[PDB]
Design an enzyme around this catalytic site. Structure first.
Site, PDB file in Angstrom:
ATOM      1  N   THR G   1       0.807  -1.218   0.000  1.00  0.00           N
ATOM      2  CA  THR G   1       0.000   0.000   0.000  1.00  0.00           C
ATOM      3  C   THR G   1       0.844   1.274   0.000  1.00  0.00           C
ATOM      4  OG1 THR G   1      -1.590  -1.225   1.348  1.00  0.00           O
ATOM      5  CG2 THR G   1      -1.957   1.138   1.135  1.00  0.00           C
TER       6      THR G   1
HETATM    7  C1  LIG Z   1       0.235  -2.450   0.566  1.00  0.00           C
HETATM    8  C2  LIG Z   1      -0.344  -3.120  -0.656  1.00  0.00           C
HETATM    9  C3  LIG Z   1       1.564  -3.159   0.847  1.00  0.00           C
HETATM   10  O1  LIG Z   1       1.664  -4.501   0.505  1.00  0.00           O
HETATM   11  C4  LIG Z   1      -0.727  -2.438   1.748  1.00  0.00           C
HETATM   12  O2  LIG Z   1      -0.216  -2.370   2.940  1.00  0.00           O
HETATM   13  C5  LIG Z   1      -1.913  -3.391   1.773  1.00  0.00           C
HETATM   14  C6  LIG Z   1      -3.135  -2.648   2.193  1.00  0.00           C
HETATM   15  C7  LIG Z   1      -4.382  -3.432   2.396  1.00  0.00           C
HETATM   16  C8  LIG Z   1      -5.610  -2.721   1.939  1.00  0.00           C
HETATM   17  C9  LIG Z   1      -4.292  -4.863   1.910  1.00  0.00           C
HETATM   18  N1  LIG Z   1      -1.640  -4.537   2.653  1.00  0.00           N
HETATM   19  C10 LIG Z   1      -1.860  -5.933   2.153  1.00  0.00           C
HETATM   20  O3  LIG Z   1      -2.254  -6.112   1.050  1.00  0.00           O
HETATM   21  C11 LIG Z   1      -1.561  -7.196   3.119  1.00  0.00           C
HETATM   22  C12 LIG Z   1      -0.210  -7.329   3.927  1.00  0.00           C
HETATM   23  C13 LIG Z   1      -0.067  -8.531   4.882  1.00  0.00           C
HETATM   24  C14 LIG Z   1       0.282  -9.791   4.387  1.00  0.00           C
HETATM   25  C15 LIG Z   1       0.407 -10.862   5.256  1.00  0.00           C
HETATM   26  C16 LIG Z   1       0.188 -10.684   6.594  1.00  0.00           C
HETATM   27  C17 LIG Z   1      -0.161  -9.420   7.088  1.00  0.00           C
HETATM   28  C18 LIG Z   1      -0.285  -8.359   6.231  1.00  0.00           C
HETATM   29  N2  LIG Z   1      -1.996  -8.537   2.379  1.00  0.00           N
HETATM   30  C19 LIG Z   1      -3.410  -8.874   2.248  1.00  0.00           C
HETATM   31  O4  LIG Z   1      -4.240  -8.148   2.694  1.00  0.00           O
HETATM   32  C20 LIG Z   1      -3.819 -10.152   1.543  1.00  0.00           C
HETATM   33  C21 LIG Z   1      -5.093  -9.940   0.705  1.00  0.00           C
HETATM   34  C22 LIG Z   1      -6.165 -11.060   0.735  1.00  0.00           C
HETATM   35  C23 LIG Z   1      -7.441 -10.702   1.599  1.00  0.00           C
HETATM   36  C24 LIG Z   1      -5.625 -12.380   1.014  1.00  0.00           C
HETATM   37  N3  LIG Z   1      -3.908 -11.216   2.511  1.00  0.00           N
HETATM   38  C25 LIG Z   1      -2.776 -11.804   3.104  1.00  0.00           C
HETATM   39  O5  LIG Z   1      -1.642 -11.431   2.822  1.00  0.00           O
HETATM   40  C26 LIG Z   1      -2.967 -12.941   4.134  1.00  0.00           C
HETATM   41  C27 LIG Z   1      -2.436 -12.556   5.519  1.00  0.00           C
HETATM   42  C28 LIG Z   1      -3.028 -13.290   6.742  1.00  0.00           C
HETATM   43  C29 LIG Z   1      -2.035 -14.068   7.673  1.00  0.00           C
HETATM   44  C30 LIG Z   1      -1.724 -15.393   7.398  1.00  0.00           C
HETATM   45  C31 LIG Z   1      -0.812 -16.115   8.249  1.00  0.00           C
HETATM   46  C32 LIG Z   1      -0.250 -15.487   9.340  1.00  0.00           C
HETATM   47  C33 LIG Z   1      -0.567 -14.133   9.624  1.00  0.00           C
HETATM   48  C34 LIG Z   1      -1.465 -13.426   8.783  1.00  0.00           C
HETATM   49  N4  LIG Z   1      -2.355 -14.173   3.645  1.00  0.00           N
HETATM   50  C35 LIG Z   1      -2.475 -15.449   4.446  1.00  0.00           C
HETATM   51  O6  LIG Z   1      -3.095 -15.441   5.520  1.00  0.00           O
HETATM   52  C36 LIG Z   1      -1.832 -16.743   3.933  1.00  0.00           C
HETATM   53  N5  LIG Z   1      -2.254 -18.061   4.506  1.00  0.00           N
HETATM   54  C37 LIG Z   1      -3.188 -18.863   3.786  1.00  0.00           C
HETATM   55  C38 LIG Z   1      -4.591 -18.634   4.241  1.00  0.00           C
HETATM   56  O7  LIG Z   1      -4.741 -18.801   5.644  1.00  0.00           O
HETATM   57  C39 LIG Z   1      -3.511 -19.084   6.310  1.00  0.00           C
HETATM   58  C40 LIG Z   1      -2.434 -18.131   5.915  1.00  0.00           C
END
Ligand SMILES: *[C@@](C)(CO)[C@](*)(O)[C@H](CC(C)C)NC(=O)[C@H](Cc1ccccc1)NC(=O)[C@H](CC(C)C)NC(=O)[C@H](CCc1ccccc1)NC(=O)CN1CCOCC1
Ligand SMILES: *[C@](O)([C@H](C)CO)[C@H](CC(C)C)NC(=O)[C@H](Cc1ccccc1)NC(=O)[C@H](CC(C)C)NC(=O)[C@H](CCc1ccccc1)NC(=O)CN1CCOCC1
Ligand SMILES: CC(C)C[C@H](NC(=O)[C@H](CCc1ccccc1)NC(=O)CN1CCOCC1)C(=O)N[C@@H](Cc1ccccc1)C(=O)N[C@@H](CC(C)C)[C@@H](O)[C@H](C)CO
Ligand SMILES: CC(C)C[C@H](NC(=O)[C@H](CCc1ccccc1)NC(=O)CN1CCOCC1)C(=O)N[C@@H](Cc1ccccc1)C(=O)N[C@@H](CC(C)C)[C@@H](O)[C@H](C)CO
EC number: 3.4.25.1
Lengths: 220, 122, 217, 213, 199, 204, 202, 201, 202
Positions: G1
């Site tokens: 982001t």
């Molecule tokens: C910019 C784009 C920088 O990258 C921003 O900061 C954005 C803003 C928002 C609006 C999204 N941030 C992201 O895109 C964000 C960053 C992130 C990644 C991982 C962990 C924490 C933060 N990524 C996401 O929002 C994506 C989008 C969709 C909804 C998937 N999601 C993920 O990255 C998730 C994170 C959740 C998590 C998993 C495991 C441990 C901690 C957190 N990806 C997963 O969860 C992967 N995995 C498979 C599914 O379930 C088990 C985990």
């Protein structure tokens, strides 16, 4: 899982494969991954099977209660809110990736819902282990305001890409078309995969199995 | 829950509910007991002989442990409650203390229970 | 290399009638940072073959040096023999597996395109020494995004014209630019024919962003 | 850190007849949840009398294959004769054990004809342990293939059945059947089935088709 | 480490256990008893963790006795076994799980002699004969080799002797003496302790 | 693996107007066998059986609690239970422990008490239902059982061919697994009767 | 982001990229990262999508009820304070970087930062997200007090363009929002509309 | 595995199962676990299959070279010591291997246990493998130096059988060899399924 | 640290900060990061002090012997190639980010980057060090082809100033070097000489 969803001129097309795995073995060759939420809202489930099942069932139930009290047709935003809030409350421990599609009093709406509780409202979405292939098909051959058969072709094509390119997906392609006044829940929309025909007869004739103990018990 | 004072003092310094309970005991079948040298005997009166009733299922004499027995007089249901709680206590004593149970001890337990019910809310 | 540093992403390849085409963006990324946005990840190995590389750019530069030296060494003899694309592929497989077995891999995934003896060649080589031949190839996210598109076409029409393959490649690079966060809108296309190896300059991909105005409805 | 291994899938089967030997395998090369190629047979012709099937990690498969080739040539130069099947089995054992502390991630089944013309299978483990068999499966879908052949070829758990020797035809259809069934359950098995038949005449190659999901 | 053994006959159940209570490298008790009288015709052989054994066993015991007092009749060996199994299984996924392996011997006026085997995971299984501990690994096969469903109590005792002697021969742990009891229509009978005159 | 601690195998097959359910008889702890007559198939009413494979304790416990809820169901409602209903019941029971699951994978086989329509399903350890028209397997030797079933099963089998099929499947799958076996039991159930047989099997 | 917010005289200007990634894959190349909290109060989200969405919803709820209960246009500082309370209280469970900005009849155009710590501070302008790192220098050398609305618009446009160009986690499309007493003017810069800069050649 | 060997008046009895597993999966039931080193030297085999096979084969090679060089047959003690010395140089590297070297020597019947751990001990009876304890039970309960030949055969065969009954990783077929002064003889090779019928009824 | 090198017509311009830190403590607030490799060949060091110093020494040695053996002014590409060889060969044991720049009779003013990978690439301009992250945007928006020597000087001065202002690991003094056919013109910007920028107030 190789699901998907698209928005066309008159409504929404939802797609899904039918392969369910445990380990690297196919457990279910025909699994229904497109779930009933409300008569105007359906939802494709990918991820932890039992989680998608119980979640989609619960939200369907709550929506039935909701519309029962309101007397109106359920909105898609409501199912989206319920789903995302429940999933977020469990902080991703409910392995449920979802494609929520439906037609409202406000029109066609398509959401993607990740197990951590985040949602995206987009004209087209994909989820599952085969989501990248399907999304490639979408990014290649999507145009706004498609006709019904065109969109059905596109979605089935996406799901097909998921099926052949991803080891996690396979078997049939299920579609669900939802317009302002129609609900086509096409179950076997395509059977692109077939088991080869047996070349032999391994039938065991009565008597080849040795028995140590027998006991017949009559019923009614 | 039911936080209401049931057993209270009267202006003359009586606990009416307890006295009433004693009157309920007075209506019970007679129950006598004597202590001897090598034996001890308990006997209960008017067992309400209907001759269509199973005698076993209405006995007013119950064993609490291998060491202690007990007869009663009054409300039979209440007596069932007290008897069972007494048996449970008899076992718990063996659990927390290797030794079994003294008659005085279980008696003191039953008495304390009854009193607790004379001074508790609801 | 135990920890890759500056890296490049997907590399595409596909055979066509009388030749092979390969694509790769000109980006070297330092993690999430698009650090070097003007580098060639495609090498001309003699006149009959060519190489595209994904992974650590430094190791790719090493392989570029070594392969260049081998080709020069051979060209010095002039004994009428030269390295066929299959031969180069075999060598590269041997090398990558050798480094793998020394527990010191060259952090690269490579696609070798070629055209010799009237036949089109396309080979894939891992950093572990996993190698194979196929009518279409995609490394990295391409293997998840571009490859499904390529196979869809090749199973509906095995033989493609050069223009058809080039179009397919362009569309795939567009998809990759859309979905791969470590890609870049500036790529290269190399082609082997009987006329030799030709690398076309900095290309851009047209992008549609109309779905930006589909938030509400 | 860094792993020098990756599982590439693949199933493998060999049956020994009185005058023949079948070595079959799927043609799917995969990695993770993706397909590398659908045209990658796991069968390798070593000699006119001997065919080898190698499954598992593709790097070690290729390497071990080329090594076996080279050493076949060496033996030929050294003794002026081709390597007998059992000899190739023993050699393969030593070669596999030579990496006892950094093994080839490879399941190996050798099918061919012995010095009396009869069929023979030799099943291997990744570090050189081998034995002679009438029929054996290996690779990902191994546990799916083995039990049927135990029943149909070994006549196991069957009361008052006749012990009729396996003909080439029945063996062929059996192979096609077990592979077709395996393609249903194993996600690493599919695309195509290549079968290699080895008789006094030589080596035939047949190619049945399996589902692509 | 502790050893239990049970052998069911046509009309009796023969049970035996080691008499060693040991900690670290020393025997701290040479007359330890691993058996618990729960009914007049039910014995509970418990073995395992430090306090878990006695705690769990005594809990079950006092609850069975409570049943007897409350109802005027004793639990059947089967009802007892399923009671203990229920308790042990309930605590399995709790905060306080009891690491105990056990045998339950009993005689019913209806069903006759019965022997039960219980994992620490609370898996209940009826058997003609069973054993717990490392010693079981050396004795069970022997029990397979010589046991017959119609074995007499004398022959059963002799078989038990074969087992214990085998323990004296192969087992690295000491285990010099053994508690031996039998159960039939007349309840629990204490037998002469099988012992080996070492020192 | 926790599932592999006790081992075992459970299978169910569909027939014409009959249904079949089989299971091995070994109760073992890791590598040692303790019992050769361990029950893994329990009747949940006339013409409706369930078969649990996995951790023995959870097999027994799930069976018992299921019988609890079932009895209460058939008491509250004046009827026998439908197969689908039993399946949903098991699913609910298992999913109640979503984050502390029983380690057992149940397999339900029966006939519709009103109709006679055959029914086979299987479930997760967290209670995800899966209904099939051919066969269902669960156990440490699931791959072997899949191998046999995919090659032996035919559609409309009579109560005799079904027996032979499920028996050969169970026997030959189990014989390639070290922690499954020590005997096989088969229940072949039809509208009129229930036939229970124990097969001649390897005991090693 | 990459998020951004600049304050001019009669209001504020908001800007954000549209890339949402899971791993190296772009799960949404067109995300709306400018979220309306009230009629003239917006927030810029960065970090976990789920977290920021949930928090934004909750704050919209609370602020709505609060503004109804007071029968007055909500202070921007109040919205920022609700965000602050939530993000600080659950700092160990949330991954959120927020920029709350908007117009308010009492204090005019305001921009507040609520970084992952849970602290809160008003700034003339604010940047956040992974891409913000690459534009600190530019934003430092380009900022000038007394910028017009259109000047701020162009400013955030350029900054976001640069950040998106450099940051891999940022990209897609540029979303802008102009907030003043007049209302909310939202627009989208895509393709050739996005500012371009001379890339080094020879 | 489940091999066992004991020496009595009439030589050295050797017995084994034939099961080979890869995890819970039974990979084979036709494994010759009694390696024929020399016509007078046998070697049982338990643990890592490849390890045992390779090292005992190498042992056989070495014994042959010894036979050629010294113009005489190697002793049991020397063979066992050879194997033990070869294996010891790899101690700690993860070789899983437990074998018995049996034969007839100038000192009469010889039986040695040799470990991959480094053990090497002579003894009357020995049982090696996952089911060794179960075999030890019946074998000890039935052993005597004054056992007649057929009796010894019965004892060994039965011990391996009961072992296969209890041990989940032991089964297949009981193989039985007898080592006499003029060499060893392949006594029997009975499948467990048949031995069940024989022993139970 | 924060290094930089820009190429103009008749040569190059080098710049670096002077902060050397161990932990959060400044072990040297006045480092000389621009290291002479040859008469008209300089290198900019970032990363481990020990590593970069050792490598610089070794390359100076090798290049000296090489230039003597050839009796010709050493090609800048050659120095960059020696650095490249060393840094690539020992990539797993070195923490070095180098920018080799200088003048050369055959190719004129040249700037090469050798980042931690061990790769090498010629650039119109190059930045490195921890602070470089904060000036990517500025350096992208400010660069213009055909800059004069003094323009490049001012350019690197401004960029380094911004980076030093934002980066905590960078700071102290600005060291500049001008390399051409004429020779080497080194200078030092300190205190008020260092470019300042308007900090946000209200
Ligand atoms: C910019 C784009 C920088 O990258 C921003 O900061 C954005 C803003 C928002 C609006 C999204 N941030 C992201 O895109 C964000 C960053 C992130 C990644 C991982 C962990 C924490 C933060 N990524 C996401 O929002 C994506 C989008 C969709 C909804 C998937 N999601 C993920 O990255 C998730 C994170 C959740 C998590 C998993 C495991 C441990 C901690 C957190 N990806 C997963 O969860 C992967 N995995 C498979 C599914 O379930 C088990 C985990
Ligand atoms: C630059 O990159 C910018 C400013 C950002 O870092 C500068 C400029 C260079 C060219 C001098 N680099 C540093 O400031 C640098 C960081 C670094 C740390 C660790 C490894 C490599 C680089 N500082 C140093 O190199 C410094 C040199 C002198 C002491 C001035 N030493 C260290 O940083 C120690 C490295 C030794 C080491 C430690 C553990 C394992 C292997 C090697 N780090 C210490 O912590 C030293 N020490 C112990 C802890 O308490 C403080 C003192
Ligand atoms: C057996 C079938 C009926 C269902 C299957 N269930 C299972 O595989 C369950 C466990 C699920 C679970 C348990 C605890 C915590 C989290 C998850 N596994 C077991 O019951 C047996 N094992 C016991 C021990 O060894 C491993 C598993 C399943 O859900 N499979 C998923 C994939 C999966 C996710 C997470 C864990 C395990 C498996 C699936 O099919 N997903 C598809 C969508 C559908 C089915 C809704 C898609 O994703 C596509 C097909 C790709 O797999
Ligand atoms: C393929 C079968 C026929 C042979 C089997 N081989 C194997 O199991 C090989 C060995 C690979 C290896 C790598 C590095 C170092 C050493 C070994 N492993 C594999 O083939 C693949 N697996 C991966 C996941 O599942 C488990 C194994 C084996 O040796 N099994 C042993 C048990 C064992 C020992 C040590 C390591 C691994 C397994 C065995 O059967 N031993 C028996 C005697 C011998 C002579 C066969 C006995 O011990 C009895 C039967 C009990 O198991």
């Amino acid at each position: 899982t190789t699901i998907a969803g698209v928005v066309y001129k008159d409504g929404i097309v939802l797609g899904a494969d039918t392969r369910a795995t445990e380990g690297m073995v196919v457990a279910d060759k025909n699994c229904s991954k497109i779930h009933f939420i409300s008569p105007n809202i359906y939802c494709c489930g990918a991820g932890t099977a039992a989680d998608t099942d119980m979640t989609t069932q619960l939200i369907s139930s709550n929506l039935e209660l909701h519309s029962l009290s309101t007397g109106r047709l359920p909105r898609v935003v409501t199912a989206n809110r319920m789903l995302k809030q429940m999933l977020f409350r469990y902080q991703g421990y409910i392995g449920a990736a979802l494609v929520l599609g439906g037609v409202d009093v406000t029109g066609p709406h398509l959401y993607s819902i990740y197990p951590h509780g985040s949602t995206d409202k987009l004209p087209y979405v994909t989820m599952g282990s085969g989501s990248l292939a399907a999304m490639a098909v979408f990014e290649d051959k999507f145009r706004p305001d498609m006709e019904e058969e065109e969109a059905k072709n596109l979605v089935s094509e996406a799901i097909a890409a998921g099926i052949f390119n991803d080891l996690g997906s396979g078997s049939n392609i299920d579609l669900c078309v939802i317009s302002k006044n129609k609900l086509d829940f096409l179950r076997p929309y395509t059977v692109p995969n077939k088991k080869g025909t047996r070349l032999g007869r391994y039938r065991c004739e009565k008597g080849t199995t040795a028995v140590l103990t027998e006991k017949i018990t009559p019923l009614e | 829950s039911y936080d209401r004072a049931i057993t209270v003092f009267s202006p003359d310094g009586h606990l009416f509910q307890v006295e009433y309970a004693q009157e309920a005991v007075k209506k019970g079948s007679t129950a006598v007991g004597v202590r001897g040298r090598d034996i001890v005997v308990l006997g209960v009166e008017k067992k309400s002989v209907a001759k269509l009733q199973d005698e076993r299922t209405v006995r007013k004499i119950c064993a609490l442990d291998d060491n202690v027995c007990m007869a009663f007089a009054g409300l039979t249901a209440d007596a069932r409650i007290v008897i069972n709680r007494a048996r449970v206590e008899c076992q718990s004593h063996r659990l927390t203390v290797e030794d079994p149970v003294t008659v005085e001890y279980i008696t003191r337990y039953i008495a304390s229970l009854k009193q607790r019910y004379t001074q508790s809310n609801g | 290399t135990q920890n890759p540093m500056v890296t490049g992403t997907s590399v595409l390849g596909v055979k066509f009638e009388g030749g092979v085409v390969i694509a790769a963006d000109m980006l070297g990324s330092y993690g999430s940072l698009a650090r070097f946005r003007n580098i060639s990840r495609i090498m001309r190995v003699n006149n009959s073959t060519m190489l595209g590389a994904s992974g650590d750019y430094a190791d790719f530069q090493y392989l570029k040096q070594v392969l260049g030296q081998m080709v020069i060494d051979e060209e010095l003899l002039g004994d009428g023999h030269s390295y066929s694309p299959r031969a180069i592929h075999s060598w590269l497989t041997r090398a990558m597996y050798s480094r793998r077995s020394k527990m010191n891999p060259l952090w690269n995934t490579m696609v070798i395109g070629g055209y010799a003896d009237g036949e089109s060649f396309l080979g894939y080589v891992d950093m572990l020494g996993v190698a194979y031949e196929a009518p279409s190839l995609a490394t990295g996210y391409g293997a998840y995004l571009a490859q499904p598109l390529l196979r869809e076409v090749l199973e509906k029409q095995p033989v493609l014209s050069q223009t058809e393959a080039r179009d397919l490649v362009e569309r795939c690079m567009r998809v990759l630019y859309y979905r791969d966060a470590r890609s870049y809108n500036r790529f290269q296309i190399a082609t082997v024919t009987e006329k030799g190896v030709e690398i076309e300059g900095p290309l851009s991909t047209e992008t549609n962003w109309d779905i930006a105005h589909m938030i509400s409805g | 850190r860094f792993s020098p291994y990756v599982f590439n899938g693949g199933t493998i089967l060999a049956i020994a007849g009185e005058d023949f030997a079948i070595v079959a395998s799927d043609t799917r090369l995969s990695e993770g949840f993706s397909i590398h190629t659908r045209d990658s047979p796991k069968c390798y012709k070593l000699t006119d009398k001997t065919v080898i099937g190698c499954s598992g990690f593709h790097g070690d498969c290729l390497t071990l294959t080329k090594i076996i080739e080279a050493r076949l040539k060496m033996y030929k130069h050294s003794n002026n004769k081709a390597m007998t099947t059992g000899a190739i089995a023993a050699m393969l054992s030593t070669i596999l054990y030579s990496r006892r502390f950094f093994p080839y991630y490879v399941y190996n089944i050798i099918g061919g004809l012995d010095e009396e013309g009869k069929g023979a299978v030799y099943s291997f483990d990744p570090v050189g342990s081998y034995q002679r068999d009438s029929f054996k499966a290996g690779g990902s879908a191994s546990a799916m293939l083995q039990p049927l052949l135990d029943n149909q070829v070994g006549f196991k758990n069957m009361q008052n059945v006749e012990h009729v020797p396996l003909s080439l035809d029945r063996a062929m259809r059996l192979v096609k059947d077990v592979f077709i069934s395996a393609a249903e359950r194993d996600v690493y098995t599919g695309d195509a089935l290549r079968i290699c038949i080895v008789t006094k005449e030589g080596i035939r190659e047949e190619t049945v088709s399996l589902r692509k999901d | 480490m502790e050893y239990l053994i049970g052998i069911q006959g046509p009309d009796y159940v023969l049970v035996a256990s080691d008499r060693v209570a040991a900690s670290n490298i020393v025997q701290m008790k040479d007359d330890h008893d691993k058996m618990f009288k729960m009914s007049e015709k039910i014995l509970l052989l418990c073995v395992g963790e430090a306090g878990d054994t006695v705690q769990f066993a005594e809990y079950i015991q006092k609850n069975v006795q409570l049943y007897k007092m409350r109802n005027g009749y004793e639990l059947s060996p089967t009802a007892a076994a399923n009671f203990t199994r229920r308790n042990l299984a309930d605590c399995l996924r709790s905060r306080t799980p009891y690491h105990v392996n056990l045998l339950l011997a009993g005689y019913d006026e209806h069903e006759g002699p019965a022997l039960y085997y219980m994992d620490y995971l609370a898996a209940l299984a009826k058997a003609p004969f069973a054993a717990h501990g490392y010693g079981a690994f050396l004795t069970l096969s022997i029990l397979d080799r010589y046991y017959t469903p119609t074995i007499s109590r004398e022959r059963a005792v002799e078989l038990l002797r074969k087992c214990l002697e085998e323990l004296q021969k192969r087992f690295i742990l000491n285990l010099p003496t053994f508690s031996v009891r039998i159960i039939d229509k007349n309840g629990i009978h204490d037998l002469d302790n099988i012992s080996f005159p070492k020192q | 693996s926790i599932m592999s601690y006790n081992g075992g195998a459970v299978m169910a097959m569909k027939g014409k107007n009959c249904v079949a359910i089989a299971a091995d008889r070994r109760f073992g702890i890791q590598a040692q066998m303790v019992t050769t007559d361990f029950q893994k198939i329990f009747p949940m009413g006339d013409r409706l059986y369930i078969g649990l494979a996995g951790l023995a304790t959870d097999v027994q416990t799930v069976a018992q609690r299921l019988k609890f809820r079932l009895n209460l169901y058939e008491l509250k409602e004046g009827r026998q239970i439908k197969p689908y209903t039993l399946m949903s019941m098991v699913a609910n029971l298992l999913y109640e422990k979503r984050f502390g699951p029983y380690y057992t994978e149940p397999v339900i086989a029966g006939l519709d008490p009103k109709t006679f329509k055959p029914f086979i399903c299987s479930l997760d350890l967290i209670g995800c239902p899966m209904v099939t028209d051919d066969f269902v397997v669960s156990g440490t030797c699931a791959e072997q059982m899949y191998g046999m079933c995919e090659s032996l099963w035919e559609p409309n089998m009579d109560p005799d061919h079904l027996f032979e099929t499920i028996s050969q499947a169970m026997l030959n799958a189990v014989d390639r697994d070290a922690v499954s076996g020590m005997g096989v039991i088969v229940h072949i159930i039809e509208k009129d009767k229930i036939t229970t047989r124990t097969l001649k099997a390897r005991m090693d | 982001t990459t998020i951004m917010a600049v304050q001019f005289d009669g209001g504020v200007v908001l800007g954000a990229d549209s890339r949402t990634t899971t791993g190296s894959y772009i799960a949404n190349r067109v995300t709306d990262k400018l979220t309306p909290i009230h009629d003239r109060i917006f927030c810029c989200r960065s970090g976990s999508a789920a977290d920021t969405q949930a928090v934004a919803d909750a704050v919209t709820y609370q602020l709505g009820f609060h503004s109804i209960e007071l029968n007055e246009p909500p202070l921007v500082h109040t919205a920022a304070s609700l965000f602050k309370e939530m993000c600080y209280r659950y700092r160990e469970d949330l991954m959120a970087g927020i920029i709350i900005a908007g117009w308010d009849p009492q204090e005019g155009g305001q921009v507040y930062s609520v970084p992952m710590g849970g602290m809160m501070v008003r700034q003339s302008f604010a940047i956040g997200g992974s891409g913000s790192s690459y534009i600190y220098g530019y934003v430092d050398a380009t900022y000038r007090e007394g910028m017009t609305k259109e000047e701020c618009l162009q400013f955030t446009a350029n900054a976001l363009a640069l950040a998106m160009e450099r940051d891999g986690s940022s990209g897609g499309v540029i979303r802008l929002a102009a907030i003043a007493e007049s209302g909310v003017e939202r627009q989208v810069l895509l393709g050739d509309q996005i500012p371009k800069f001379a890339v080094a050649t020879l | 595995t489940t091999t066992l060997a004991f020496k009595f008046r009439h030589g050295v009895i050797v017995a084994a199962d034939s099961r080979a597993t890869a995890g819970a999966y039974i990979a084979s039931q036709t494994v010759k676990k009694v390696i024929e080193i020399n016509p007078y030297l046998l070697g049982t085999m338990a643990g890592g299959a490849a390890d045992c096979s390779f090292w005992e084969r190498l042992l056989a090679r070495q014994c042959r070279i010894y036979e050629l060089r010294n113009k005489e047959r190697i002793s049991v003690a020397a063979a066992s010591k050879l194997l033990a010395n070869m294996v010891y140089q790899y101690k700690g590297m993860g070789l899983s291997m437990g074998t018995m070297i049996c034969g007839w020597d100038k000192r009469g019947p010889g039986l040695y246990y040799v470990d991959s751990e480094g053990n090497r001990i002579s003894g009357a009876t020995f049982s090696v493998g996952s089911g060794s304890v179960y075999a030890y039970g019946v074998m000890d309960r039935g052993y005597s130096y004054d056992l007649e030949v057929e009796q010894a055969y019965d004892l060994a065969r039965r011990a391996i059988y009961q072992a296969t009954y209890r041990d989940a990783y032991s089964g297949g077929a009981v193989n039985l060899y007898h080592v006499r002064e003029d060499g060893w003889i392949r006594v029997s090779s009975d499948n467990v399924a048949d031995l069940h019928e024989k022993y139970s009824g």
